[PDB]
């Protein structure tokens, strides 16, 4: 099955955040749909519940979480909703949409409870200064995560190093590398594809020789 | 709330040998029905998690034969026989028996052990646009290596630098168990251009001397 997972973002201390999911692969309307959170410091915490038109749309929420967040499920759409009113700093986290305790994963969406500004990414090309060659990609200065890094529109994928991104005073640095073979940069062009959904950008740098 | 204590934090195994990981709660979960409602997950590197096991024991769709699940009561043991690559990453246990909520474990963590991989280290000098801004990183690679104990270093005019340095590893890939490593040392424009050779060094097991990669301004 597959279940896709919208909305999320950047979102100020206090303020409230709507997350949609979108379910396919299986009868949405049979099943319990629960939302669940991840982060380093939590790890995997449950956090809400929903059931059928046949159990009252029953619902539970995890202690915290309780009296801020509603969940709520469309079986006509075939998506389960999840309001999230006064958001703290602790609600930071990656959320993932899930049908039954729990059967199928959605891919998760990434919130960011801070009340700094949505930032897009700058790319800089890594081009060297072997029968390889390495070339890479530096983003820099983006606020929140995630952006997701792409070579040649995902065509090249097997020689691909992507680095998790770090937050410092620059907002957030992340890097990529890709390595393929010298006889083929730069005649056939290598370019890093860098998409921030939070800002609604997208970045595309074709990596040429220095 | 029931806690679920997975036991160790990580482990390491060679392929085709097995592997088992523990997974206490506070009570037994035993139902008053049947047995547990204990289920293994796993979670790729960069994926969401994936129920592998249900009800103690039962392989949910598409799992293969290797992975099984023992355990009864408080304690629960899952075993892969022959271990592969792509099992690694991380293995949770959650619970639905005594609920609400319905909680989690705190993952174990599987590592390839794989033979010795020294780095392939590349360096970048900065690129025309960051400098227009102002800016000046270096960046150093670091790329398929194992074990993941590595230290780098960064060396400006021969003499070591250690603040502006960002690091970064990604996760063991399961195409070839290694991990990488990306070193940025971060500069302003003003101090990049008072200093010509710019070197990171990499230290590793696989090695007596260290990596170097380097170059001077002067390219």
């Known amino acids: 099955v597959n279940l896709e997972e919208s909305g999320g973002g950047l979102v100020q201390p206090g303020g409230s955040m709507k997350l949609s999911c979108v379910a396919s692969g299986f009868t949405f309307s049979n099943y319990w749909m629960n939302w669940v959170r991840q982060s380093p410091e939590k790890g995997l915490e449950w956090v809400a519940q929903?059931?059928?038109?046949?159990?009252?749309?029953?619902?539970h929420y995890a202690e915290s979480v309780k009296g801020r967040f509603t969940i709520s499920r469309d079986d006509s759409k075939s998506s389960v909703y999840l309001q999230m009113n006064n958001l703290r700093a602790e609600d930071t986290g990656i959320y993932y949409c899930?049908?039954?305790?729990?059967?199928?994963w959605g891919q998760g969406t990434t919130l960011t409870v801070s009340s700094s500004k949505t930032t897009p990414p700058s790319v800089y090309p890594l081009a060297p200064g072997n029968s390889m060659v390495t070339l890479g990609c530096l983003v820099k200065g983006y606020f929140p995560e995630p952006v997701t890094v792409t070579w040649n529109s995902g065509a090249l994928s097997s020689g691909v190093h992507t680095f998790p991104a770090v937050l410092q005073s620059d907002l957030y640095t992340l890097s990529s590398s890709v390595t393929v073979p010298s006889s083929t940069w730069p005649s056939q062009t290598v370019t890093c594809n860098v998409a921030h959904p939070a800002s609604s950008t997208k970045v595309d740098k074709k990596i040429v020789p220095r | 709330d029931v806690v679920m204590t997975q036991t160790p934090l990580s482990l390491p195994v060679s392929l085709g040998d097995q592997a088992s990981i523990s997974c206490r709660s506070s009570?037994?979960?035993?139902?008053?029905?049947?047995?547990?409602?204990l289920h293994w997950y796993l979670q790729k590197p960069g994926q969401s998690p994936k129920l592998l096991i249900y009800?103690?024991?039962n392989r949910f769709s598409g799992v293969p034969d290797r992975f099984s699940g023992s355990g009864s009561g408080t304690d629960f043991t899952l075993k892969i026989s022959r271990v592969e690559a792509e099992d690694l990453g991380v293995y949770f246990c959650?619970?639905?028996?005594?609920?609400?909520?319905?909680?989690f474990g705190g993952g174990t963590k599987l590592e390839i052990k794989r033979a010795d991989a020294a780095p392939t280290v590349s360096i970048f000098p900065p690129s025309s646009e960051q400098l227009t801004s102002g800016g000046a990183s270096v960046v150093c690679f670091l790329n398929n290596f194992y074990p993941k104990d590595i230290n780098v270093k960064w060396k400006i005019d021969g003499s070591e630098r250690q603040n502006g340095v960002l690091n970064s590893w990604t996760d063991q890939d399961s195409k070839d168990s290694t991990y990488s490593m990306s070193s940025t040392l971060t500069l302003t424009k003003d101090e990049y251009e008072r200093h010509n050779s710019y070197t990171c060094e990499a230290t590793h097991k696989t090695s007596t001397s260290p990596i170097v990669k380097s170059f001077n301004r002067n390219e």
């Open positions: 899930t049908g039954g305790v729990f059967d199928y």
């Open positions: 959650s619970q639905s028996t005594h609920v609400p909520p319905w909680t």
């Open positions: 009800k103690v024991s």
């Open positions: 929903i059931r059928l038109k046949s159990d009252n749309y029953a619902t």
């Open positions: 009570q037994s979960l035993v139902h008053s029905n049947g047995n547990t409602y």
